[PDB]
Amino acid sequence: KVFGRCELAAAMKRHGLDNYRGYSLGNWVCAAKFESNFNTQATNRNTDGSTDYGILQINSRWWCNDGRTPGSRNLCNIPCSALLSSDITASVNCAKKIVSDGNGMNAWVAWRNRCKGTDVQAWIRGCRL
């Protein structure tokens, strides 16, 4: 599923991401835009052989099991394919664990490089929330 901008914002808000650990909703929508272009089916392979999955590009090196990243962890306790669902519940619940781990949203490279320190409220402007 390729989300619309406001559609995703409303889904994220419903799942408790707005101001989660101090990160306003705009931060999450911006991250998803630049990580996956709002596409739940996005995958990208990393140099180390791990793979990033889904709308928030969660990495199989630490967070999910894909059966092909030897010596990796599965901290969210889910198969990586669960992160590709049109239902964002699994991605959100795992993201909540990631952002709580001490490094905040800096875990997401595209957030650090393209959202951090910008006017992120622009990403939810005009949305019925």
User: Does 104 sit near Cl ion (CB under 5 A)?
Assistant: yes
Nearer to Cl ion, 103 or 121 (CB): 103
Q: Least distance (Å) from Cl ion to the CB of residue 97?
A: 14
Sort residue 52 into left (φ over 0), alpha (ψ -120 to 50) or beta: beta
d(CA 32, CA 36): 6
Q: Least distance (Å) from Cl ion to the CB of residue 98?
A: 12
Is 48 noted as a catalytic residue in this protein?
A: no
User: Does 79 sit near Cl ion (CB under 5 A)?
Assistant: no
101 annotated to a ligand binding site: yes
Is 35 noted as a catalytic residue in this protein?
A: yes
Query: Among 7, 18, 35, 87, which one carries the catalytic annotation?
Result: 35
Taking the CA atoms of residue 32, residue 58, residue 103 and residue 17 in that order, the dihedral angle to the nearest 10 degrees is 50
d(CA 27, CA 116): 8
Q: Which residues are the active-site residues?
A: 35, 52
Contacts to Cl ion by CB under 5 A: 104
